[PDB]
Amino acid sequence: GVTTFVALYDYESRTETDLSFKKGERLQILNSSEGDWWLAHSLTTGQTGYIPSNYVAPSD
């Protein structure tokens, strides 16, 4: 099922596989919310990559 989040702070990509996003973006994960780093897709920008859980909060 869909599992969505909203970004609380801007995050700038620093690796080959993470995902830059801005505060307020809507993001969905493509597996479970276990752990601290999630493969995600931005509904806002269309881009994908790993995001840190401590930058986002659940969004229905």
Side-chain angles (χ1 to χ4, degrees), residues 1-30 32-33 35-60:
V2 174
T3 306
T4 36
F5 299 87
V6 60
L8 309 181
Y9 322 119
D10 295 357
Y11 176 82
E12 184 203 7
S13 165
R14 293 304 176 86
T15 76
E16 302 292 339
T17 56
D18 61 355
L19 166 66
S20 296
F21 53 84
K22 305 282 189 182
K23 179 170 176 178
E25 283 192 32
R26 298 245 306 149
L27 312 162
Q28 72 176 322
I29 57 175
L30 301 177
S32 86
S33 68
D36 287 1
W37 281 92
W38 306 326
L39 184 73
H41 159 253
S42 174
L43 287 72
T44 303
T45 71
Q47 300 278 52
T48 70
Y50 291 103
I51 66 174
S53 64
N54 55 7
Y55 275 61
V56 306
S59 176
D60 288 339

